[PDB]
């Protein structure tokens, strides 16, 4: 019997079985309601330092594949599920779940009451936790580790996941027919956008590429100055893990961009930064939004979108500078989801327009960005 254990900051224990690597995992514990999309979710940099619990019982039904990786690696700290299926059963599968987990050296546990954990996290809020997988997983140790966990509040995680050097991205989206495309030639892209890598998802890039943008991915700490030197058609602010607030450099640089007429667009962490750089404040959510069935209303059009969410922090609406107009709101909880600079070509979104995994409902958000771009070039 391959034992495994999960212990929460508060002393709550969950006994199950090991399905990943051998060892220990510590991080903030969250729950995600997506019934499909597990690989994409584990591979999203925004999950770095977090222990991901999946509410949907059977995780691994379709195994895994490269095309379904949202990044260079598994950022999730640990994986907590209810049931690891006997087999992966999908034409796109290249390796079973457990094997991928092991290959990615991830500590994972299965066979536990994810529902009770979910309800606990819902009612009491996020909690730090530790998963120990091995012959004789120590419960006290686990609890120690969880208690010790410094916590995500005030933690800059962007500088930790960002790229080392800048680079180009010209690869577009995947299609059932031909899989992932061959990166385009630079002359195949009208537009040139600079994307700050705060722990950016591949789907965002690919989608931008689908829209005619050749990209220049830059490290999280790049100076506005260095950027501007590049004569960008548009500037993009990626999603990413941790607290946005502590990211002074980003805020600083953005503010700078906001002096200029350069179009700015942000998603999730990007959205928060943009709000910070604009005078708004950020808060830590009780438990956040992590799932793919989240209704968000476009207040302007009075239309609802089913969205993919992944955030533990949010922009406080009652601290929004008058130059900051509310564009979208959560239909689940009234929390802020979109904003637009009344005075500048800049806007952002709390959710993941690029989905992956999740509904395509929010993808049009990208088009406004392209609009801005096109117009800026006119000028």
């Amino acid at each position: 019997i391959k034992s495994a254990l999960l212990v929460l900051e508060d002393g709550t224990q969950f006994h199950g079985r090991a399905i990943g690597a051998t060892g220990s995992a510590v991080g903030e514990v969250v729950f995600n309601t997506s019934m499909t999309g597990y690989q994409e979710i584990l591979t999203d940099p925004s999950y770095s330092r977090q222990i991901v619990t999946l509410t949907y019982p059977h995780i691994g039904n379709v195994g895994t594949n490269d095309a379904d990786e949202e990044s260079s690696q598994v950022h999730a700290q640990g994986l907590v599920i209810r049931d690891l299926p006997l087999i992966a059963s999908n034409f796109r599968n290249t390796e079973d779940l457990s094997s991928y987990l092991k290959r990615h050296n991830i500590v994972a546990i299965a066979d536990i009451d994810t529902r009770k954990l979910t309800r606990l996290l819902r009612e009491k809020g996020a909690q730090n936790g530790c998963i120990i997988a091995g012959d004789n997983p120590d419960a006290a140790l686990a609890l120690e580790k969880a208690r010790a966990f410094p916590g995500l509040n005030g933690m800059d995680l962007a500088k930790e996941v960002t790229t080392a050097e800048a680079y180009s991205w010209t690869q577009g989206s995947w299609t059932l027919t031909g899989g992932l495309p061959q990166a385009k030639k630079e002359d195949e892209l009208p537009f040139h956008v600079v994307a700050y890598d705060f722990g950016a998802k591949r789907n965002i890039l690919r989608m931008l590429v689908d829209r005619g943008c050749r990209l220049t991915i830059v490290p999280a700490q790049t100076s506005a100055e260095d950027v501007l030197k590049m004569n960008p058609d548009g500037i993009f602010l990626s999603n990413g893990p941790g607290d946005p607030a502590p990211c002074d450099y980003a805020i600083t640089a953005i503010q700078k961009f906001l002096e200029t007429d350069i179009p700015v667009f942000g998603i999730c962490l990007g959205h928060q930064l943009l709000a910070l750089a604009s005078g708004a404040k950020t808060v830590k959510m009780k438990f956040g939004h992590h799932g793919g069935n989240h209704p968000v209303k476009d207040v302007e059009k009075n239309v609802v979108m089913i969205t993919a969410q992944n955030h533990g922090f949010a922009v406080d609406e009652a601290t929004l500078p008058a130059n900051l107009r509310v564009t979208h709101k959560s239909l689940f909880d009234g929390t802020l989801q979109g904003i637009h600079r009344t005075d500048k070509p800049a806007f952002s979104f709390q959710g993941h327009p690029e989905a992956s995994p999740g509904p395509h409902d929010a993808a049009p958000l990208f088009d406004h960005f392209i609009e801005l771009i096109e117009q800026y070039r006119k000028t």
Binding site: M35, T55, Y56, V62, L86, H294
Partner: protein
């Protein structure tokens, strides 16, 4: 955005009587729609010929019409109610068809009736398969290679193109009605002919085969704001080729990657947008090639369905309620989600933290020569649903709640049967109702998962799980009961294993296993359904059992709880009538102040609607499952008498296990059920029972038969034997012997007894004589021929029995009236399937009433003391599934075969009869040529009938003997030859449409067997036919009435009672 202001009154088109492919799901949906429209302050009008519907309850709507769902009748209703709009998406295909007929007839225009929910164009765009194919092509969605055919010529050309096998699908049909798979020309011709004549647009779509591909469904919802959500995804366990309704299906989808899922999601929304559904739900179907994920759209149903009902139950998202409101201008964003205390909007996509499993319920055993292989045309009669934290756990619970005698994966074949691997291969390759159990037997036999895959095309994802259960079973059998340590036992439980199944394997009684669990403190916890994987709290108590850590039951200590036990999946004989009763008990006792707990697992019903009770446990209605709930609920009383056989069978054990079973005692019931005990009681009371006997051996019976006298009723497949030879005859082919009462009138009496008094609920007179099962008999309330005197004796006999048996709640007594003398057929110390009918006719809600009585409130206390004898005639007629099983002889007998019923209301029995008959989809005409071919005994009576028809202006035909007797009477019918007599023979004439009516009576096994042809031909050709002289008489009577003349609301009717 809010509610529409231009509309004040709405007409809701009901589904009509229950049929294979169109069942209870429509009472659930219709009741929902009413509730939601009434809630929103609209004036509610509905038509629905099925009286055993909650939707037809008076208090549920403003104007309730239990009338034939005939466009002419609907027109009167409209003319009389002037509804502003009509909601046609909640009554199955009947509602769709009707809506479009009225539209076509220009009735809608005529009375300025606005069609809401789905527009006639959207409905046709979806129902007309030609149009649907075009639409797909427009939006670039892929469909299989197909061809439209309006004639057999047209059709054969397509077959030549697409090749065999090919799928035949009629436009304007559902539940695979009129369709099938054709493996050869002969099959092809047959299905097409049937389909062409069945299609309301006389059209068929014939498609190349995609058999074996994965099959999926998605329940979508769209609003006027273009907001659109996927409420539930469904993956079929059985692949493409077996209708979804005859398939084991699970929610959610299991083997699709997110990428594929999104494609499918988008496609689904595209579908509704192109068809034009903007204010309601719709079911969209797909086929996926597992080898490359190739997506193909199959069809879409612009309304609520059996899947939407399943989805609703599965997710906790009440689709029909929401859809109803969407029909009147509301948008999803404005509606609240019920289960999340309304703290969240309806505009969202549900997320579930468990697996939902549905298994169809079949009844092939009731259909002699029916082909029993599954195909594209539905054959199931019901369904069970179950929920578990795991697929294994979900599937096994469903199996044990299926009401077939399974306790899980019980073996079908033996291990040491050399031939087994043969039977197994067969059962896999060509699926029947038993396949699930064969899959397990195959694994026990050494077949690999790949081996199984290759024969069934069922995803290995599911297969591997069944194999694992097997290996586990083997372990259990190996280690035995001593090997059943708490760890292992818990593993088992968590995998869904039933005590019963472990018991069998371990070779012990089921109670033994339960004891063990009791010793180990091994009990399930209850999780709640919430639509959101627990992301938001719930104030609703809709739960399922599982073997996990935290329990969410949180039973209340505050109230007096009452449990009501449902009947599980529906089957022939155990229909909606029972659920109806169940629902009532809950509503009643809830209203009265009790905390009502409902226990059931039929996803189609109103009883499994969270709104029906205080607490709902969607569980298998088994001793095990029921005892666990009782353990924690610690209720005050349990009602076992209203869900049919399922809960009745449990009564004894429950009580012994300590359950506070209320109303008529288990023992009392046994007194009545038990042949011996009963007979013995009947005696004690000195009443009439037919001469009977219990035989062991053949010759034993031949002699005993001699005693009792012929004809006999032989019960082991129960047959009527007329002579020694016949007796013997049956024996080979083959113990209770009962003297058959020929030419007798069968009566049904429903009533309530509080131990203090007896309330006569209703005395119904069967049109068909004793010998035709009561369940398949048309009946009249009040009696239409029986004398008062004779009726008074019954009343008297009822009362004596009531007291003697110690009835405490409902009972039903069956009588036979022969020669002014009354005989006792049987006693049913419980709620009968006639209860809803009687309640609807008399205005008294017997189920409510008897419920209170069982719960301690006397009839007196209630104020229900006098027997209602309505100022009108109410006639109940049935609907039979013969059309679904062409190989069967479409003839009535002592065994029940009907799936549904209808009610007919009239100022005269003839009126009521004509209404009941039309409502039953009869094809009877008021003119033409009638064919008469009756048995000997009917020879005398047939003259009058022949006379009546002549009077009616019909022309007659008759078989030899029949013509003899007629001529001897001055009636010279036209002679026709029996098939074997040569041309021109009945078969030809029938086929050539020479008759509009047929009266065919037969008696005797071979005699029936030999005349099979006429009845089958009658059915295939659409000629209304009676198989009883009584039925024939009633039909003739109805010739004098006009069912489209007068219409009446239940409310109105009810108000006419004094």
């Amino acid at each position: 955005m809010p509610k529409r202001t231009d509309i004040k009154s709405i007409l809701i088109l009901g589904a009509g009587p229950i049929v294979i492919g169109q069942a209870c799901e429509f009472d659930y949906s219709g009741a929902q729609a009413c509730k939601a429209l009434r809630e929103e302050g609209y004036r509610v009008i509905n038509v629905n010929s099925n009286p055993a519907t909650i939707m037809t309850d008076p208090e549920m709507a403003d104007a309730t019409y239990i009338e034939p769902i005939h466009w002419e009748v609907v027109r009167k209703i409209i003319e009389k109610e002037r509804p502003d709009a009509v909601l046609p998406t909640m009554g199955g295909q009947t509602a769709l068809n009707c809506a479009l007929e009225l539209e076509r007839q220009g009735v809608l225009e005529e009375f300025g009736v606005t069609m809401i929910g789905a527009t006639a164009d959207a409905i046709d765009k979806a129902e007309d398969r030609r149009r649907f194919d075009v639409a797909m092509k427009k939006i670039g969605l892929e469909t299989a290679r197909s061809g439209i055919a309006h004639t057999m010529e047209e059709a054969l050309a397509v077959a030549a193109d697409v090749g065999f096998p090919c799928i035949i699908r009629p436009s304007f049909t559902m539940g695979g009605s009129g369709g099938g798979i054709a493996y050869n020309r002969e099959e092809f011709e047959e299905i097409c002919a049937r389909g062409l004549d069945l299609s309301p647009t006389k059209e068929l779509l014939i498609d190349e085969s995609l058999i074996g591909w994965k099959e999926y469904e998605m329940e979508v919802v769209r609003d006027k704001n273009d907001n659109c959500i996927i409420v539930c995804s469904i993956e079929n366990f059985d692949a493409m080729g077996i209708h979804t309704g005859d398939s084991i299906t699970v929610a959610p989808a299991q083997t699709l990657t997110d990428k594929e899922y999104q494609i499918m999601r988008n496609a689904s929304m595209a579908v509704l947008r192109e068809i034009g559904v903007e204010t309601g739900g719709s079911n969209v179907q797909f086929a996926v090639n597992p080898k490359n994920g190739r997506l193909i759209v199959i069809e879409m149903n612009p309304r609520v369905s059996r899947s939407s009902a399943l989805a609703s139950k599965a997710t906790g998202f009440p689709i029909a309620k929401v859809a109803a409101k969407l029909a009147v201008g509301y948008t999803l964003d404005e509606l609240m989600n019920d289960i999340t205390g309304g703290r969240t909007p309806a505009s969202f996509e549900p997320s579930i933290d468990y697996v939902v499993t549905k298994i169809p319920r079949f009844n092939f055993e009731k259909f002699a020569g029916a082909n029993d292989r599954l195909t594209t045309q539905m054959k199931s009669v019901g369904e069970v649903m179950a929920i578990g934290r795991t697929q294994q756990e979900s599937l096994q619970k469903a199996l044990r709640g299926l009401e077939v005698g399974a306790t899980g994966f019980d073996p079908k074949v033996s291990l040491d049967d050399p031939e087994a691997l043969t039977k197994i291969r067969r059962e896999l390759k060509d699926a029947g109702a038993d396949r699930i159990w064969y899959i397990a037997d195959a694994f026990r036999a050494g077949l690999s998962v790949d081996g199984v895959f290759n024969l069934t095309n069922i995803d290995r994802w599911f297969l591997v799980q069944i194999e694992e259960l097997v290996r586990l079973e083997e372990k259990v059998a190996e280690v035995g009961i001593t090997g059943l340590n708490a760890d292992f036992l818990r593993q088992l439980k968590r995998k869904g294993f039933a005590d019963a199944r472990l018991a069998k394997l371990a070779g012990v009684r089921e109670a033994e296993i339960r004891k063990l669990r009791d010793q180990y403190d091994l009990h399930p916890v209850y999780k709640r359904v919430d639509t959101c994987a627990a992301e938001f709290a719930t104030d609703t108590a809709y739960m399922y059992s599982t073997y996990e850590e935290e329990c969410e039951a949180n039973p209340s200590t505050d109230r007096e709880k009452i449990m009501v036990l449902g009947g599980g999946p529906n089957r022939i004989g155990q229909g909606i009538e029972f659920d109806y009763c169940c629902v009532h008990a809950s509503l009643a006792l809830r209203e009265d102040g009790y905390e009502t707990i409902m226990v059931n697992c039929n996803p189609e019903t109103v009883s499994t609607d969270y709104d029906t009770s205080d607490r709902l446990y969607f569980e298998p209605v088994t001793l095990e499952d029921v005892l666990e709930i009782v353990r924690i609920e610690k209720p005050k009383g349990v009602i076992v008498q209203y869900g049919g056989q399922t809960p009745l069978k449990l009564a004894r054990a429950l009580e012994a296990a300590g359950v506070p079973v209320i109303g008529t005692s288990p023992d009392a019931i046994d007194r009545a059920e038990d042949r011996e005990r009963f007979q013995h009681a009947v005696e004690r009371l000195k009443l009439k029972q037919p001469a009977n006997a219990t035989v062991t051996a053949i010759e034993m019976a031949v002699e005993k038969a001699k005693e009792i006298g012929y004809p006999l009723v032989v019960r082991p497949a129960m047959e009527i034997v007329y002579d020694e030879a016949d007796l013997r005859r049956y024996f080979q082919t083959a113990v209770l012997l009962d003297h058959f009462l020929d030419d007798a009138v069968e009566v049904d009496v429903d009533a309530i007894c509080d131990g203090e008094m007896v309330l006569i609920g209703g005395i119904m007179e069967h049109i068909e004589q004793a010998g035709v099962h009561s369940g398949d008999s048309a009946c009249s309330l009040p009696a239409y021929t029986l004398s008062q005197e004779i009726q008074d004796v019954m009343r008297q006999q009822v009362q004596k029995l009531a007291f003697e048996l110690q009835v405490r709640g409902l009972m039903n007594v069956q009588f036979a009236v022969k020669n002014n003398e009354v005989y006792l057929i049987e006693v049913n110390p419980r709620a009968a399937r006639t209860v809803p009918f009687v309640s609807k006719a008399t205005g008294v809600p017997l189920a409510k009433v008897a419920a209170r009585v069982m719960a301690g409130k006397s009839l007196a206390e209630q104020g229900v003391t006098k027997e209602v004898i309505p100022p009108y005639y109410s006639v109940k007629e049935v609907v039979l599934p013969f059309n679904k099983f062409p190989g069967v002889d479409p003839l009535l007998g002592p065994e029940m075969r009907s799936t549904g019923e209808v009610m007919g209301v009239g100022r005269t029995f003839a009126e009521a009869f004509a209404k009941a008959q039309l409502g039953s989809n009869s094809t009877m005409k008021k003119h033409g040529r009638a064919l008469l071919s009756v048995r000997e005994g009917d020879k005398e009576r047939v003259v009058d009938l022949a006379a009546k028809l002549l009077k009616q202006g019909f022309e007659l035909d008759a078989t030899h003997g029949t013509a003899i007797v007629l001529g001897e009477a001055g009636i010279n019918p036209r002679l026709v030859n029996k098939v074997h007599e040569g041309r021109p023979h009945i078969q030809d004439r029938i086929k050539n449409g020479e008759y509009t009516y047929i009266i065919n009576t037969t008696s005797g096994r071979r005699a029936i067997e030999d005349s099979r042809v006429i009845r089958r031909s009658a059915l295939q050709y659409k000629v209304h036919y009676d198989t009883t002289l009584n039925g024939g008489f009633a039909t003739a009577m109805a010739l004098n009435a006009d069912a489209t003349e007068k219409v009446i609301s239940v409310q109105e009717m009810h108000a006419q009672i004094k």
